[PDB]
Amino acid sequence: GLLPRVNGTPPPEVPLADIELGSLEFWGRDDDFRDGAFATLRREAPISFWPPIELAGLTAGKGHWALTKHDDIHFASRHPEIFHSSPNIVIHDQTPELAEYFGSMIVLDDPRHQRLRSIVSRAFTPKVVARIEASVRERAHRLVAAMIENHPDGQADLVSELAGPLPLQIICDMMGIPEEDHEQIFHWTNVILGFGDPDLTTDFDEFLQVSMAIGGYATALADDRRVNHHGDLTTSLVEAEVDGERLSSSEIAMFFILLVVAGNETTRNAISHGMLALSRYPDERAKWWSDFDGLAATAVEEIVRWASPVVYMRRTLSQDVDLRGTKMAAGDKVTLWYCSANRDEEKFADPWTFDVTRNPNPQVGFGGGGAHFCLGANLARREIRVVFDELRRQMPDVVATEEPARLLSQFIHGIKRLPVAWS
Numbered sequence: 550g551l552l553p554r555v556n557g558t559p560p561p562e563v564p565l566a567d568i569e570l571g572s573l574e575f576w577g578r579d580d581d582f583r584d585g586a587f588a589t590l591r592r593e594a595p596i597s598f599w600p601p602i603e604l605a606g607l608t609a610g611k612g613h614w615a616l617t618k619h620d621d622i623h624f625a626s627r628h629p630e631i632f633h634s635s636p637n638i639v640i641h642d643q644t645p646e647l648a649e650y651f652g653s654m655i656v657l658d659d660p661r662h663q664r665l666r667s668i669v670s671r672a673f674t675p676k677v678v679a680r681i682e683a684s685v686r687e688r689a690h691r692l693v694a695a696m697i698e699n700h701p702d703g704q705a706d707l708v709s710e711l712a713g714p715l716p717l718q719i720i721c722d723m724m725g726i727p728e729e730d731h732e733q734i735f736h737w738t739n740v741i742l743g744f745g746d747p748d749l750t751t752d753f754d755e756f757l758q759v760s761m762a763i764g765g766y767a768t769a770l771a772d773d774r775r776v777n778h779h780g781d782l783t784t785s786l787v788e789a790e791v792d793g794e795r796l797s798s799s800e801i802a803m804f805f806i807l808l809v810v811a812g813n814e815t816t817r818n819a820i821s822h823g824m825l826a827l828s829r830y831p832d833e834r835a836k837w838w839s840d841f842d843g844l845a846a847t848a849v850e851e852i853v854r855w856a857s858p859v860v861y862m863r864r865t866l867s868q869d870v871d872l873r874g875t876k877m878a879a880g881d882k883v884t885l886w887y888c889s890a891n892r893d894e895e896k897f898a899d900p901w902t903f904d905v906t907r908n909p910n911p912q913v914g915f916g917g918g919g920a921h922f923c924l925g926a927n928l929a930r931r932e933i934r935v936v937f938d939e940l941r942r943q944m945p946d947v948v949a950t951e952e953p954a955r956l957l958s959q960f961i962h963g964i965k966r967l968p969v970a971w972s
């Protein structure tokens with residue numbers, strides 16, 4: 550990066566009185582402050598109740614109980630009957646009438662959840678998976694090679710040229726989406742991901758129109774595969790069946806919309822954060838680059854722990870709960886701070902060390918476990934592995950050259966711009 554930081558440096562002590570999770574100012578602070586704040590919560594107030602971020606002039610919603618300890622987050626995850634994912638998994642849903650439209654299975658509880666997830670899982674047939682794995686390698690290889698051909702100067706923004714496009718190109722390939730439609734899908738996806746960001750001034754009207762357009766695209770794509778079988782995920786989604794239940798084109802479209810967010814910005818930020826850490830801790834980059842295949846599993850897992858691309862997921866209590874002697878009421882919101890669990894001193898030795906050999910690594914960046922456990926976790930690990938493999942092969946000395954431009958977000962640990970250079 551630019552800022553010298555010794556591997557293993559703990560975050561500053563942040564006094565409890567200085568932590569305001571309900572403050573947009575809090576989420577704009579650097580990671581050192583945020584990590585130190587969650588370190589304080591874990592030690593002094595591991596379960597605590599916060600108001601949601603108020604966007605002045607817009608409805609804010611009711612507050613939430615922050616779970617900051619790995620054990621609590623794991624417990625909440627493994628009890629979806631108490632900690633519901635319906636109505637939604639963000640602190641405050643700005644379009645609650647569209648919660649299932651954008652959320653597909655992630656906003657569902659059982660039995661609806663298990664039915665949808667089972668049928669979707671069935672669609673990942675060996676032939677479809679093999680195509681996905683080939684796509685991961687091909688797209689990573691192509692995007693890194695193109696970075697080189699597009700930048701004779703040896704510098705680029707990792708996010709725009711690689712971390713951003715790779716996950717979405719992979720989702721497009723698995724849905725069987727023609728190369729010519731990539732620009733449209735990219736534009737729609739970026740408007741959706743960009744909505745609400747201070748700098749991307751997209752209005753709600755454009756956001757809705759884009760949201761319906763990409764849904765209509767996906768329904769049309771699904772409908773085409775009902776007549777024209779192909780070896781893509783879309784066809785296997787239309788053909789998959791569990792206990793006689795099949796997916797409508799509308800349900801497939803909502804799952805696609807989930808993927809272009811949940812399968813996309815997450816992996817993007819894992820990659821960018823992994824690049825930043827491998828840049829800040831060059832001994833870890835040397836270790837991995839010296840034994841790439843042998844260390845890939847622990848290196849990737851450590852990148853996910855380190856990045857925690859999903860900062861939190863929200864649950865809603867169906868029943869009163871008591872735990873760490875803290876009474877939480879039925880109907881209360883609960884938030885699972887993976888960013889905090891992934892630094893929990895009770896679970897990880899040397900939590901502040903980015904260690905590509907880390908083992909064990911019970912990181913919950915894909916969630917605490919249980920029913921909603923990241924459907925694409927293995928795909929994400931593969932994308933991470935392969936993209937760093939292609940960087941190792943084509944530009945082994947690539948390094949971040951500047952601190953990243955951070956996404957202002959409570960939900961996504963986002964990097965907007967990560968300058969890199971290579972020789």
Ligand code: HEM
Nearest residue numbers: 654655812815816819859914915916921922923924925929
């Ligand atoms: C580094 C990248 C990723 C991270 C950190 C991440 C994280 C997560 C998290 C935290 C959840 C909620 C887990 C829970 O509530 O217990 C989730 C769900 C999900 N993810 Fe991922 N994810 C990533 C990549 C992907 C990819 C590549 C896919 C592509 C298939 C994907 C598909 C999904 C789906 C479909 C769900 C909802 C599963 C359900 O509700 O049952 N994810 N992800």
Ligand SMILES: CC(=O)OC/C=C(\C)CC/C=C(\C)CCC=C(C)C
Nearest residue numbers: 639642643644651741744810811859
């Ligand atoms: C702004 C936007 O993204 O679309 C509207 C979505 C809303 C208002 C709810 C947001 C929740 C999701 C999109 C599920 C995403 C899951 C992961 C990233 C892991």
Ligand SMILES: [N+]
Nearest residue numbers: 571572573574
């Ligand atoms: N604030």
